[PDB]
Amino acid sequence: SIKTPEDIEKMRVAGRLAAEVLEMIEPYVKPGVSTGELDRICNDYIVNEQHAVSACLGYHGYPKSVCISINEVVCHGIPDDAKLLKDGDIVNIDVTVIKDGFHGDTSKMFIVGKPTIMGERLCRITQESLYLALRMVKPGINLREIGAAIQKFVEAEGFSVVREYCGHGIGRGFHEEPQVLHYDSRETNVVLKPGMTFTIEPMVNAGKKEIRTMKDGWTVKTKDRSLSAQYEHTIVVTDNGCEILTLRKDDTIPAIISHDE
Ligand SMILES: CCCC[C@H](N)P(=O)(O)O
Numbered sequence: 001s002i003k004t005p006e007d008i009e010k011m012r013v014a015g016r017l018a019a020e021v022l023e024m025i026e027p028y029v030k031p032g033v034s035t036g037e038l039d040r041i042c043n044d045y046i047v048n049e050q051h052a053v054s055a056c057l058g059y060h061g062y063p064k065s066v067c068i069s070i071n072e073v074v075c076h077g078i079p080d081d082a083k084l085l086k087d088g089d090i091v092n093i094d095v096t097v098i099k100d101g102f103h104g105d106t107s108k109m110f111i112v113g114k115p116t117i118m119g120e121r122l123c124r125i126t127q128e129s130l131y132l133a134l135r136m137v138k139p140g141i142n143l144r145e146i147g148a149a150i151q152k153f154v155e156a157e158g159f160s161v162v163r164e165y166c167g168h169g170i171g172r173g174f175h176e177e178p179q180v181l182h183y184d185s186r187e188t189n190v191v192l193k194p195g196m197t198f199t200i201e202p203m204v205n206a207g208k209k210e211i212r213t214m215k216d217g218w219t220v221k222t223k224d225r226s227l228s229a230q231y232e233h234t235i236v237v238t239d240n241g242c243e244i245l246t247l248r249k250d251d252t253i254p255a256i257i258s259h260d261e
Pocket residue numbers: 056057059062067075076094095096105165201232
């Protein structure tokens with residue numbers, strides 16, 4: 001659907017809150033901390049200070065407030081008090097908050113302690129794949145072209161793109177049309193129009209693209225157990241580009257990307 005200026009302003013607020021959760025949690029992502037504790041810190045912040053709510057809790061039965069994925073875990077990892085972070089771990093914390101009826105969905109990678117060269121490389125390339133997609137967003141561009149560009153870049157940099165999960169429209173609904181694939185698919189044919197709001201969240205594997213879903217129905221891992229990284233931003237298509245609604249202080253791209261002169 002096409003969001004009204006009123007809807008978009010509410011999404012700016014929700015997106016900002018989701019981003020602030022990631023900015024807040026940063027210092028706590030240290031060796032020795034449990035993902036369960038990280039989840040509590042995030043949830044307490046969302047509820048007690050932001051006065052919002054996690055869109056994750058109860059969603060299709062999801063048991064926690066945020067998703068925390070480590071190393072070979074591709075996405076939707078479930079916070080656990082017994083899972084401790086250690087040196088070299090690459091960790092994704094995926095936050096989705098609902099505020100004033102609208103969603104803000106975003107995630108970023110954190111590297112614990114001493115980084116490993118490939119771990120840093122994978123995260124760097126993954127974020128750049130997201131940035132490349134973001135710089136392409138504007139009315140007239142087809143989602144298929146965006147997916148194709150992400151895949152071309154990721155593969156050109158020696159990595160692979162997960163196919164089973166994708167970006168998505170977002171608003172009063174957590175996941176709305178359309179699907180935002182991060183690869184070139186013949187199924188995709190959506191011409192972007194101003195007012196559309198959706199996420200871009202490429203999952204990149206250091207090894208092969210194949211994944212495997214654990215018994216809990218949420219935790220997804222790389223089939224070859226290679227590392228997997230992901231970054232996600234919620235955006236709104238503007239008349240001449242896009243506006244990132246979940247930008248953080250550490251992002252190295254501006255919130256508004258216009259293609260004018
Ligand atoms: C509990 C569901 C988590 C959904 C993720 N935020 P995404 O939509 O980025 O995959």
